[PDB]
């Protein structure tokens, strides 16, 4: 599989904090998805299930008509060595657990994924799920790894046009749904495709430390946003708290050519210090 | 007393008020904490260890106090933070149906490690003799139990004792305080503590549309001027008290 990449023009703008704002222009410093970035286009037809590294956040999505895309698995070892944070989910049920497993060799789905048991430290099995002609259901999923929370902001939207598979051009925020306070070092990531042989296409982005300018509506929702590290016009609209700059020359930042090596020049004497004489002394003094 | 269960509690709202609702004649001695200031510190995981210790040996259940039951069945270092309850139940425990229902161990070849169980199947060894798994001289079952007949004094009745251990590690905001309520008053400058926010202002209940998840209501001046009612969902508007400047 030679996985291609699509564009992510304006997608992945979640609510950083929990504060009602009305007609404001805030500038938050959190882990968002950069505008017009490269997002992998893993296609499931004949099917893919990689071990993509969960660095500091991923922007999961799905564009299909069925519900074969349901479930996630997190962890660093995934071989019953360390804990896990699977997000197994199905029709009107959520099987999110913390117990560690070895699955079999690779997840696929019935509880045919995992064949082991251990001490589970959470019981958030709570029922409420996280899930026309060509009204396809796009379901974004932002996962983070904050000190004590998982930050699982997600949402759902319908798309109309039956054009070739591609992220639509339209702003959409991601309201929080579940905030299970489980802390575990997560490095790996895996999606749980429903086998059901008796197809789809999930996108997997990556978050980076950025700086955005979120505009809130009178109703209290984020209608649009502009990055501050994409184009000079964006940095100009960021330094001045506005979305429509006027005619003129504006100061935005200062170029500073960054390094490219770290030279360490210490003396070339090589011996052993006589600390044994002073510290490990036979007779001390007064 | 040697085979004790260890229950692991998760995120919840623990109310330390039903502990003193059972039958009378129960102790509430704590170690490092107090029942009046119990719902003030935040703990991640609380472990309950149940055991059937009884008699004049509950007083020596403390860090740095060796006895005859806490020497090879349960050891606690000098860091225990919790309260021990030893209420008596002499109605459904002491029965004539069976006297060997509860067990009791004896001295071992070495001291037990604190917070570790000693499930063992072998027979005690005197040190130098062939045991061969038989009941002979210097080779006997160290699980010497006692009977339970509803005729002895107070010092021999079954005492249901359970300890609680409070740990503090790198964990999110776990169980801390059962709850609180003060029956808020509207349209009057008074102190408020709505979900952490310890501010002073007036409630006016503005008609602003909060999102299902949005709790706070800060403004373009970085000042919280709207909060969601915790118990009965409603959007308030915390406006500061009346103030100004006098001129003579």
């Amino acid at each position, epitope marked *: 599989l030679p996985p291609a990449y699509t564009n992510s023009f304006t997608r992945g703008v979640y609510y950083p904090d929990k504060v009602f704002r009305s007609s404001v222009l805030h500038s938050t410093q959190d882990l968002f998805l950069p505008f017009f970035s490269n997002v992998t286009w893993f296609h499931v037809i004949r099917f893919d299930n990689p071990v993509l590294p969960f660095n500091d956040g991923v922007y999961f999505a799905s564009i299909e008509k069925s519900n074969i895309i349901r479930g996630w698995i997190f962890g660093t070892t995934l071989d019953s060595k360390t804990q896990s944070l699977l997000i197994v989910n199905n029709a009107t049920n959520v099987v999110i657990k913390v117990c560690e497993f070895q699955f079999c060799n690779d997840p696929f789905l019935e509880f045919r994924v995992y064949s082991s048991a251990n001490n589970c430290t959470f019981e958030y099995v709570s029922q409420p799920f996280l899930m026309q002609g060509n009204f396809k259901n796009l379901r974004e999923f932002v996962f983070k790894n904050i000190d004590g929370y998982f930050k699982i902001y997600s949402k759902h939207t319908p798309i109309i046009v039956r054009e070739p598979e591609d992220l639509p051009q339209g702003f959409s925020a991601l309201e929080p749904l579940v905030d299970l306070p489980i802390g575990i070092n997560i490095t790996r990531f895996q999606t749980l495709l429903a086998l059901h042989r008796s197809a789809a296409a999930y996108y997997v982005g990556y978050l980076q430390p950025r700086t955005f300018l979120l505009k809130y509506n009178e109703n209290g929702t984020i209608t649009d946003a502009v990055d501050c590290a994409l184009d000079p016009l964006s940095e100009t609209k960021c330094t001045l708290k506005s979305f429509t700059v006027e005619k003129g020359i504006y100061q935005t930042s200062n170029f500073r050519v960054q390094p490219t090596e770290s030279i360490v020049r210490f003396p070339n004497i090589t011996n052993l210090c006589p600390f044994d004489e002073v510290f490990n002394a036979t007779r001390f003094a007064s | 007393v040697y085979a004790w269960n*260890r229950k692991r509690i998760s995120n919840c709202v623990a109310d330390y008020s039903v502990l003193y609702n059972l039958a009378p004649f129960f102790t509430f001695k704590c170690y490092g904490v107090s029942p009046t200031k119990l719902n003030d510190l935040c703990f991640t995981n609380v472990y309950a260890d149940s055991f059937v210790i009884r008699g004049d040996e509950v007083r020596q259940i403390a860090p740095g106090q060796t006895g005859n039951i806490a020497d090879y069945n349960y050891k606690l270092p000098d860091d225990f933070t919790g309260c021990v309850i030893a209420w008596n139940s002499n109605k459904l425990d002491s029965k004539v*149906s069976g006297n060997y*229902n509860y067990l009791y161990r004896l001295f071992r070849k070495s001291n037990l490690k604190p917070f570790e*169980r000693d499930i063992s*199947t072998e027979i005690y060894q005197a040190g130098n003799k062939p045991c061969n*798994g*038989v009941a002979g001289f210097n080779c006997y079952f160290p699980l010497r139990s006692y009977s339970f007949r509803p005729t002895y004094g107070v010092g021999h009745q079954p005492y249901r004792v359970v300890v609680l251990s409070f740990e503090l590690l790198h964990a999110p905001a776990t169980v801390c305080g059962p709850k609180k309520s003060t029956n808020l008053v509207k349209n009057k400058c008074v102190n408020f503590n709505f979900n952490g926010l310890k501010g002073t202002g007036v409630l006016t209940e503005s008609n602003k549309k909060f999102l299902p998840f949005q709790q706070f209501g800060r403004d373009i001046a970085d000042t919280t001027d709207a909060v969601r009612d915790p118990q009965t969902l409603e959007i308030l508007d915390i406006t500061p008290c009346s103030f100004g400047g006098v001129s003579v």
Partner: antibody
Amino acid sequence: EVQLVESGGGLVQPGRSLRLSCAASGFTFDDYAIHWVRQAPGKGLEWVSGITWNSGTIGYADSVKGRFTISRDNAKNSLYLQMNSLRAEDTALYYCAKHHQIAVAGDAEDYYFDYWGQGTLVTVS
Amino acid sequence: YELTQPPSVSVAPGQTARITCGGNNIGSKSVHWYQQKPGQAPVLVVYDDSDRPSGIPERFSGSNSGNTATLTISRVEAGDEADYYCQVWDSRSDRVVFGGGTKLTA
């Protein structure tokens, strides 16, 4: 689903000691009671002992008191049984049965088996 | 406690059988039943005379009347020949009193 693996059993001399183990797999080892009940060949069954969801002994028979010791391990999820002073009338298939109900706090004492195993031929001769 | 069970009950596969377990004052305590096939593992059948487990058809039923617990099997076939056991709690002794099962042979 439920896999109650039973281990421990063989030919031992009368008067020796042994340890049988029953490991659970498939369900949670925190809210289900597990009992040991022998079964003589062609002569019915006979309940030996049992333990509730927590570390608790329910009792024994009129001929096994003081000789057998049952224990539970929620860390390893296993029920162990140590036998002492075995005689000629202890040759039976010891089965490890589970419980159906969740054993809520306030109820009546009524335990019944829901799942069965295979048993281990523990012969004493 | 002590339960009395019939040594062997035979009946043609055209009608129902009568497997009874009675005691001294067993009128309110729960009565459970089990069915063990020769060679295989036992299984649960209608217990408490008021409910059945998942998988047991409507053919099995239980009825307690005063001092007799009857296990009625409907449309007995050749595949139902097994050993039926009845279990009582008897909280007075803190035990589990079993009894000699009946070898139902069609």
